[PDB]
Amino acid sequence: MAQERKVALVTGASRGIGAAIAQQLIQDGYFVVGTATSESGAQKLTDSFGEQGAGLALDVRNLDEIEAVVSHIEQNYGPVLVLVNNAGITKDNLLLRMSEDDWDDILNIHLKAVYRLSKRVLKGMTKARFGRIINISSVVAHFANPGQANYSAAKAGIEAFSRSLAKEMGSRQITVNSVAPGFIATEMTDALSEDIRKKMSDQVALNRLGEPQDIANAVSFLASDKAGYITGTVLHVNGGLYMA
Amino acid sequence: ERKVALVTGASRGIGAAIAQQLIQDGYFVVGTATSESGAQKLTDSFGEQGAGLALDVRNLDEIEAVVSHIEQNYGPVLVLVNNAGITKDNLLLRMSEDDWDDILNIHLKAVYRLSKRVLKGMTKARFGRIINISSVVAHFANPGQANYSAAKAGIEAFSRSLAKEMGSRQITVNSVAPGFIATKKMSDQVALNRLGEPQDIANAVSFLASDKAGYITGTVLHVNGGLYMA
Amino acid sequence: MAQERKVALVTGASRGIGAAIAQQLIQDGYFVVGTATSESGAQKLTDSFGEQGAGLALDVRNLDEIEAVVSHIEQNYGPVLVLVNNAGITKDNLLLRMSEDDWDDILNIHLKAVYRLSKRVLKGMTKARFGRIINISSVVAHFANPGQANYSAAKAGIEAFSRSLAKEMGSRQITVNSVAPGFIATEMTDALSEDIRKKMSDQVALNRLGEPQDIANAVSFLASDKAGYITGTVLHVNGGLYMA
Amino acid sequence: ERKVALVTGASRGIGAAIAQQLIQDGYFVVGTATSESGAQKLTDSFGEQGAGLALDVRNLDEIEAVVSHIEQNYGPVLVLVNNAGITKDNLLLRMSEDDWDDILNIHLKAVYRLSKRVLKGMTKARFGRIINISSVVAHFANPGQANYSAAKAGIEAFSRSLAKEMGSRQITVNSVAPGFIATKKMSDQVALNRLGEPQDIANAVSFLASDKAGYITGTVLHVNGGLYMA
């Protein structure tokens, strides 16, 4: 029997936020394809999802890989009808020490990848007259952070891209939205001290760090029928760290 | 039994959809109408999972009597949805003091009054949801609606201040800003090329009132089909 | 000889920001009417402005006073063509201790006064096909501050009011804008300790408290021909305390 | 002598108005064009109060040569106005990699590159103005402009980050977002019921580059006639 569930593609699904998003979309009833940067990582995803998802190796910096991955999904599982752009890294530096590579690599991994993957999935969504593109942004696209001019520019760019695309695709009942996490407990915050986590949580109105599941819950909502009249927005999930 | 939600203006439209959805979600819903007859209709619709009460949100005495009644009979209000409203549009040159004041009182003052009155129960519970219905026109301005736009924008700023005050007690305070909701030129302005339905707003309120939105506070959730985008 | 300069009305011009705005608009060439809450305060303003302005007593809570003041200006100096809504106070309290009076008095002094004064001056601006309404808002209408739910609601309301009015009056070449100060050195910050002023200035990107003249400079710009294509905006003057 | 301003794309339109205004304000203005012929025309327009240089902001080598030349011959760049730009609009389905990349490079990458290159002189002076020309469409979205809107929104966020980095040295970093500027259906969307002129933008840049805006940093100054309001 053929794969019959709607297909979601979640980039960077190995851990933390990406992993929680992938698992929640599986629980919601999607067939989930998740990506990792290595075959070994991809195989781990495959095993975690069991027979309701697949893991694929992908470096989102490369158009040929993006095209190959989506073609593979279309040929084996179905058209990508939910796209979650989550994969990313940071290369922080004050501008006076921010190299051409530091800049280009971050813009390519974040903003260029959103452009490339969004463009590649539009045809299938158009034919379906259904689609969800959900981009993971950051509180830092709103609240200024020194040392992250590259990351902030990319994430803000993604939000503006999302608005333009939402206008273009709305008549096909495709929604395009962003989710902007605040302080979410991840590998990186785990590496910080208890004292610094307390300083962080004191700035959050809710007085605690969030969890990957909080971001998964937002993505889940946006990907659902409960959010069909929401498009071109940023859904802030930061515990009142930043309010708009 | 269940946690109690209070939904103001639950007789029809958006409020009715919200009240019915929160019932389906598992809340005991107290819905309000401006008449005793409207309040009875709600009691009859909700049956065992809710109650109807008459309330004019312009009046502090009624607000205090209504919440007291709920506390005596059903339990503390742990989800407050401030939805009751009207419009009295006019270009500023034709906008009377009464038209200004009545809109500010029904929308913004009521949010201040009801929010203040429910804080103690939420604080004791270390749980709460205050969900205020705003509007797209608090962002995308419309001539003739200076009173309504001022009130809804006020509500949003109120909500941010209160979110900061109450967050440590795990009370979230948020706004939902509907676009054009059906109660051709309009739907052409919307990216999705259709008007919204009350259920679209109920769905957003339902999300916010749930554990799925436990880390969301002080925000505006825009439900407008791409009529206005941030 | 009759009063020939364009007339500006600046509410609460006794000190700090209001005083600096009034004096700058005089330097710009306006005839400035400033207000104070007492006759004694009004007389001080009269003397400070010399023969290029007037002081009038006004409590902006009262419609009859607002109407009387503007009528007086029209009968003696000219139509109000620049309106600067600056007068105000705070009555801070956490919501559980914020009384009906605390709420009503702040909404009336800030938002109702803007509505009342704006409405009262429109006819003269309409006839002139020139007008500037400039409302003094606050960073707190944007950046959440506990204890100021009344003040934040009023200032945010003023900004939304300004947008609606800007749409209504734009075809008459009347602009309606707000200026949102951050940490400005005033009587109130003078009353704080050196330590607390240092904590404040550490949060400002420019690493210092602003001065009343910084707000006057913004108001001056908006009231000028250099800002004739700017309407319905908030001009933030906070040294990068809050960025949008 | 005077403080040096660099204005990219000063040949015509908004950039030309900015360059002429900054001259009137008292800056020595270095303006740029994409050709040697265009650069000569600027040198001739500016006379004693400015110079023209050829620059394609897509190229890092040219950016570095241009600023070095200015530093050798005129003084450190203390006011940088990033204005040079083009559009390559298309619906996303027809937007090629080249059309994406070229817009990102000319707009956003150039702002990164030029800002980085001028920091040292501004830091030494403990004075600086970086003024980036954005656009209303970074806020009020337009179909067909996903590349341009992404770049301009990126520029604004870049500007906020840099404003935080450089503020202690009294360097301000701000964006000016023009609406429809003339270079009927359009002017009906504008509250002021007319298109803007290049001078409206020059006036806003002039304000920001002056001591009258010494406490303004990390902001967007909207100059759009009420086409889009915050």
Ligand SMILES: NC(=O)c1ccc[n+]([C@@H]2O[C@H](COP(=O)([O-])OP(=O)(O)OC[C@H]3O[C@@H](n4cnc5c(N)ncnc54)[C@H](OP(=O)(O)O)[C@@H]3O)[C@@H](O)[C@H]2O)c1
């Ligand atoms: N954590 C937070 O608090 C926070 C706050 C704001 C925004 N965000 C955003 O939320 C998203 C999740 O971030 P995170 O902190 O959870 O990340 P993370 O735990 O570090 O995970 C990174 C993921 O992205 C993948 N990845 C890295 N480089 C890649 C490339 N070139 N191509 C394809 N995939 C690549 C990684 O693959 P491998 O595992 O195979 O290396 C991994 O799955 C990001 O977009 C981030 O910017 C997070």
Ligand SMILES: NC(=O)c1ccc[n+]([C@@H]2O[C@H](COP(=O)([O-])OP(=O)(O)OC[C@H]3O[C@@H](n4cnc5c(N)ncnc54)[C@H](OP(=O)(O)O)[C@@H]3O)[C@@H](O)[C@H]2O)c1
């Ligand atoms: N519809 C839209 O497109 C739209 C867009 C943006 C925002 N909103 C907001 O959504 C909310 C609901 O709007 P709607 O379109 O559903 O309105 P609606 O269909 O006219 O319903 C109004 C409700 O409020 C109640 N109400 C009116 N005045 C009241 C008072 N003084 N005290 C107590 N209750 C009162 C009414 O009670 P009775 O039935 O007893 O009269 C009714 O239940 C409002 O806050 C509105 O501003 C709506």
Ligand SMILES: NC(=O)c1ccc[n+]([C@@H]2O[C@H](COP(=O)([O-])OP(=O)(O)OC[C@H]3O[C@@H](n4cnc5c(N)ncnc54)[C@H](OP(=O)(O)O)[C@@H]3O)[C@@H](O)[C@H]2O)c1
């Ligand atoms: N200072 C800051 O850092 C800051 C920050 C954000 C926003 N703001 C805003 O900027 C404006 C200036 O504030 P400020 O702190 O400079 O004020 P301030 O120095 O305390 O001056 C208050 C002024 O308003 C007048 N006033 C008070 N109550 C009045 C009433 N009922 N009717 C008429 N006039 C009245 C006072 O008159 P008398 O002198 O006769 O009493 C005085 O001239 C205000 O709107 C404020 O909300 C200031």
Ligand SMILES: NC(=O)c1ccc[n+]([C@@H]2O[C@H](COP(=O)([O-])OP(=O)(O)OC[C@H]3O[C@@H](n4cnc5c(N)ncnc54)[C@H](OP(=O)(O)O)[C@@H]3O)[C@@H](O)[C@H]2O)c1
């Ligand atoms: N016009 C509007 O309504 C509007 C609205 C929003 C934003 N803006 C922004 O305002 C800025 C100026 O726009 P405009 O309307 O004045 O444009 P314009 O009249 O077409 O002028 C463009 C300028 O940029 C230069 N330029 C183009 N490509 C370049 C490159 N690769 N390297 C260096 N310089 C280059 C041109 O030089 P040559 O003369 O040598 O070709 C010219 O001086 C742009 O950033 C634009 O995005 C304009």
